[PDB]
Amino acid sequence: ATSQDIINSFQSIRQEMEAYTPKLTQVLSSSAASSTITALSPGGALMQGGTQQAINQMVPNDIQSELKHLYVAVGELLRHFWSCFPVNTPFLEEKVVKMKSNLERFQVTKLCPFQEKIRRQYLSTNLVSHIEEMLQTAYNKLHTWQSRRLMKKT
Amino acid sequence: RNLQEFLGGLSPGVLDRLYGHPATCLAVFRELPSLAKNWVMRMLFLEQPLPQAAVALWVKKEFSKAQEESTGLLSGLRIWHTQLLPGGLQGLILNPIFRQNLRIALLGGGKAWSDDTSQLGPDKHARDVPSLDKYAEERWEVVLHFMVGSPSAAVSQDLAQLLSQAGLMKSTEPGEPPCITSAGFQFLLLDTPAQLWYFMLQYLQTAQSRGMDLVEILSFLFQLSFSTLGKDYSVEGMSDSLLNFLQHLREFGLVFQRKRKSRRYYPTRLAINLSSGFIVVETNYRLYAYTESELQIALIALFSEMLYRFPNMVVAQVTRESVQQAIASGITAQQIIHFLRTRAHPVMLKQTPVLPPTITDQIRLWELERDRLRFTEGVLYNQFLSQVDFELLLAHARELGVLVFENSAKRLMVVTPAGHSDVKRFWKRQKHSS
């Protein structure tokens, strides 16, 4: 890793543990035990009890049906995009651009009103986040492939 | 009875004083259930009481029964106590003395349980582990023979008085040896560690009669339980009464000591197990025992018919007549099954269960033969002219709690002989009021 400072640290710890004596009080303290119990108590950091408390009844099923429809549409569009990939012919180059344009139009048409409705109802779930992740990944992949295509022509 | 049953019946002061010894705390802890031990370990380093609901939320809903049982056991043993948490809540915190002593016994601190062993140097007359085990077995066999009454066993008069107080043997006529009762036979059939524990419990229940400190005796016994086999300890540092108690231990074989004035004592394997195979059973009702001492031979012959006695082997047959005779002697079938399971040869341990089910079922069925007929002395009433009159008398008898059997269909009832007088007076009084 680093320079001979690693060997210096090894020698230092060897000397430190050369004279080793067991301890009792220093091992645990009442404050440390209380903090550990609070962390391990229900509702704590490691025992997070929320985890979308009533997501089955949160974000009403009217929105849930629309969310499922958006998921299906995005899945179909991405399936078409990945079927087009990889682009081995110049014909597919325009098809991927058309698919990207369709994805952007669908996003603007549906997800933006979807995001507005979610913000109006102030739903705590980040339902849009996963959809954005897939769309962002597809856009990044297309941009990377276009960059490669430009580099191949250099 | 187990240790927890005896401890739960003690006063809070006795329990508090018992926790003052590190050895006692470990013995109490190892008797706790598995769920209780985790709670004790978690609360080991807590200086603040915890809410009852918070502790209750650690266990799942389905296992709430075990949680309640463990909490009740801990409350009875007074390991922890409820604290009035500010705001109307109830806080649970372990006993500070018990917690400190347990931490000392685990982490370390204070002085050792024994005073010292290197002050006197090596033992001039030290023995070996097999020799100690042989001495303990000989002492136990002598005790059990004295229970039978053979002249080969000679023990102190105090031991005979203790046995008489234990109810195993009663001295109807002074001077003559006591006669062993049915409870004596049941105790004799019991397992050796179980017999030791029962004897110690009987000693403790009557410990106050000799003016001996129960707490000190219990602490010393627990310290002996955790003692390392084959290593001696210093007699010095103990009260005289405890020393006298130690002498009784020397009589029982739990502790080996060459002389009464000696400062060394060697705990035995029996003393270690106080805090808590050679018999092969065949499907044809045959027992093959790899034993030589007359004690095991007599114990097996108590409930079976002996057939052959090879110098290192005993071949016996378990028959209906022998089991019936043993039951008539007062020994139950469950005791026989437990004895066979405890003495089971290591080869049979592969079988699941160790004893074949057919033999145990046959023994249990043979036990049920004796109690086929049920006998209840009483007085029969059959002269009820009216159902309403019968109902009132039956209700009065049930209120008196002397009813044995009732038949409202035929207006027939039976009362105990003692309660017959009250029923007769009540029936006569009702007619007088009519």
Contacts of B50 in chain A (CB under 8 A): 37
Q: What is the Cα–Cα distance from B4 to B70, expressed in whole angstroms? A: 12
Contact B213, B239 (CB under 8 A): yes
Q: Cis omega (within 30 of 0) on the bond before B178?
A: no
Burial of B103 by CB count in 10 Å (0-12 exposed, 13-18 middle, 19+ buried)?
middle
Length of chain A: 154
Q: Which long-range contacts (CB under 8 A, 24 or more apart) does B378-382 make?
A: B378/B404, B378/B414, B378/B415, B378/B416, B378/B417, B378/B420, B379/B414, B379/B415, B379/B417, B379/B420, B380/B412, B380/B413, B380/B414, B381/B412, B381/B413, B381/B414, B381/B415, B381/B423, B382/B411, B382/B412
Q: Which of A76, A64, A74, A50 is nearest to A132 (CA)?
A: A74
Q: How far is A55 from chain B (nearest CA, A)?
A: 23
Closest chain B residue to A37, measured at CA: B42
Q: Does B177 touch chain A (CB under 8 A)?
A: no
Contact B275, B222 (CB under 8 A): yes
| Pairing label, strands B313-317, B379-381 | unpaired
Q: What is the Cα–Cα distance from B332 to B334, expressed in whole angstroms? A: 5
Contacts of B46 in chain A (CB under 8 A): 30, 33-34, 37
Contacts of B42 in chain A (CB under 8 A): 37
Checking chain B for breaks where C and the next N are over 2.5 Å apart, the residues before them are 276
- The method of structure determination was cryo-EM
Give the tokens for residue A80: 């078409």
Closest chain B residue to A34, measured at CA: B46
Contacts of A29 in chain B (CB under 8 A): 45
Smallest Cβ–Cβ distance between A42 and the set B46, B57, B108 belongs to B57
Cα angle A111, A113, A119; round to 5: 100
Contact B343, B277 (CB under 8 A): yes
Resolution of the experimental model, in Å, one decimal: 3.6
Contact B85, B91 (CB under 8 A): yes
Q: What is the DSSP letter of B344?
A: B
Q: What is the DSSP letter of B168?
A: S
Spatial CB neighbours of B235, under 8 Å, sequence gap ≥ 6: B243, B246, B257, B262, B263, B264, B265
Q: What is the Cα–Cα distance from B167 to B181, expressed in whole angstroms? A: 8
Look at phi and psi of residue B245 and say left if phi exceeds 0, alpha if psi is from -120 to 50, else beta. alpha
Give the tokens for residue A130: 């996963």
Spatial CB neighbours of B264, under 8 Å, sequence gap ≥ 6: B120, B123, B232, B233, B234, B235, B257, B258
CA atoms lying within 13 Å on the CB side of residue B228 = 7
Amino acid at B63: F
The string of DSSP letters for B106-128 reads HT--S--SS--SSSS-S-TT---
Q: What is the Cα–Cα distance from B139 to B257, expressed in whole angstroms? A: 13
Amino acid at B196: L
Burial of B218 by CB count in 10 Å (0-12 exposed, 13-18 middle, 19+ buried)?
buried
Q: What is the Cα–Cα distance from B294 to B302, expressed in whole angstroms? A: 12
**H helices of B149-262, where?**
157-166, 182-189, 192-205, 214-225, 240-252
Run of H or E residues at B234: strand B233-234
Residues 109-128 of B with CB under 8 A from A: 109
Contact B43, B50 (CB under 8 A): yes
B54–A30: do the CB atoms touch at under 8 Å?
A: no
Smallest Cβ–Cβ distance between B46 and the set A27, A30, A42 belongs to A30
Question: How far apart are the two ends of chain B, measured CA to CA in Å?
Answer: 55
Checking chain A for breaks where C and the next N are over 2.5 Å apart, the residues before them are none
Q: Does A1 touch chain B (CB under 8 A)?
A: no
Contacts of B47 in chain A (CB under 8 A): 30
Residue found by looking up tokens 């095991």 in the block: B296
Smallest Cβ–Cβ distance between B107 and the set A24, A30, A34 belongs to A24
Run of H or E residues at B421: helix B420-433
Q: What is the DSSP letter of A108?
A: I
